[PDB]
Specification:
The complex is a heterotetramer, with 2 copies of chain A and 2 copies of chain B.
Chain A (H helix, E strand, L loop, with lengths): L1 H6 L6 H15 L3 H9 L3 H6 L6 H14 L4 H9 L3 H10 L2 H15 L3 H9 L3 H10 L2 H15 L3 H9 L3 H7 L5 H15 L3 H9 L2 H8 L5 H14 L2
Helix pairs in contact in A: 2-5, 5-8, 7-8, 8-11, 10-11, 11-14, 13-14, 14-17, 16-17
Chain B lengths: L6
Classes of the chains: A mainly alpha (about 240), B little secondary structure (about 5).
PDB class: de novo protein
Keywords: Designed armadillo repeat protein, peptide binding, de novo protein
Assembly: tetrameric
């Protein structure tokens, strides 16, 4: 029963709370129809409120649940935004533990896979500066999630690409085109290719960041997905 | 071209 | 790009 | 309450009085998280950890049992156990204690490993990986079962922690345990392998070199649902 589970999300007993959270998390990972049941049961507002509580154990499980709800359709992401999820998720990128940060980045990356109005709400919540910061100081595992989030934001409109440039994304993205991991290069090259499809001013900023020789190195890559994006970005730089 | 992926 | 991963922890 | 008196009695010269208070503490430790919290607030953790190095086998056995139960608490309670300096003496019990004490120390470590990644990091720093990996071969079938679960919990950590497990030589004995005579051992081994399979490409390559694919393929047609889901997930990652 979902209504009792939702009620248990504001229970003083930490075991009853954690048990209700685990039950909710399992439902949230079961596809869009299961996510819809959570929305209809009014689970999103109490879930989001758990991002501010004292226990890092509770926050970790709540972030996991939110990240899975964010894998839902755009209307489901919209309900998560309406429940006030973005400001507390962005806040976790600054003061929470590395384990909590990784899950918050995954939630943000999933929200960024939504429509341009949803990417706009992420930008307004202040996601760009902490995401760009993660591209160089965080662990290889967190870098992979951060680049994917940025690649999703870069798929937005030219005004959103401009906000990424202003947040200082180009220098670390160019550096990640020569990263050891192919999965990192894949997202880095897609982000660059998206920025390359922007306006002439944005193309000039890519050239100034040294994208051209970095992209020329990748047009000989064994990974076919990397090769296509590199070629596209290079054709955009030479117009 | 198309910017988004899914 | 939407992604869903299995939880490592039980 | 009666708890400050039993904590005081953990330092009693009378061995019957010490054992009685220790037994009282252990029953409270096994009584759930609210009961563990009462032990923490009575300052029981520091004296209990000091008893792991006592000259009495009976005292050590009861103290490790109490510590393992405290470690079954929430993450904040595991943190208090770490802050009480429990990790170094628990890891030490793996190299010099009796088989009965070793089993309870492994169960304590497995519980701590169910905590957050920073707590798994503390276990790694305490040198738990080398003796745990050694227990996958050089131990009784019951100790092997506890050891694989401790390693599976460590494998649920971040990629750098999975890396430490690979460097400790965990992959070869884990793959061997995918076809162990005991279904309970297979269950933990397949979970640990599925966790390692969710790692980076270099880690997936190390799993391939350890011969995980033919071992997991044999587990594709298994009556256990969790084993089937884990075997399939690890195979999907190996062929992605």
């Amino acid at each position: 029963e979902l209504p009792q589970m939702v009620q248990q999300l504001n229970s003083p007993d930490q075991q009853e709370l954690q048990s209700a959270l685990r039950k909710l998390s399992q439902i949230a990972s079961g596809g869009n129809e299961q996510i819809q049941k959570l929305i209809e049961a009014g689970a999103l507002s109490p879930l989001v409120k758990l991002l501010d509580d004292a226990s890092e154990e509770v926050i970790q499980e709540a972030v996991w649940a939110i990240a899975n709800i964010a894998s839902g359709n755009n209307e489901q992401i919209q309900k998560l935004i309406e429940a006030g999820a973005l400001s507390p998720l962005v806040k976790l990128l600054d003061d929470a533990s590395e384990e909590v940060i990784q899950e918050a980045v995954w939630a943000i990356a999933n929200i960024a896979s939504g429509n341009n109005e949803q990417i706009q709400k992420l930008i307004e919540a202040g996601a760009l500066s902490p995401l760009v910061k993660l591209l160089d100081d965080a662990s290889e595992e967190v870098i992979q999630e951060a680049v994917w989030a940025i690649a999703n934001i870069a798929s937005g409109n030219n005004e959103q690409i401009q906000k990424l440039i202003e947040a200082g994304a180009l220098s670390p993205l160019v550096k990640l085109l020569d990263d050891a991991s192919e999965e990192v290069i894949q997202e880095a090259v897609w982000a660059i290719a998206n920025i390359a499809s922007g306006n002439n001013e944005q193309i000039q900023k890519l050239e100034e960041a040294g994208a051209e020789p970095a992209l020329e190195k990748l047009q000989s890559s064994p990974n076919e997905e990397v090769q296509k994006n590199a070629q596209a970005a290079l054709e955009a730089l030479n117009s | 071209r198309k910017r988004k992926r899914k």
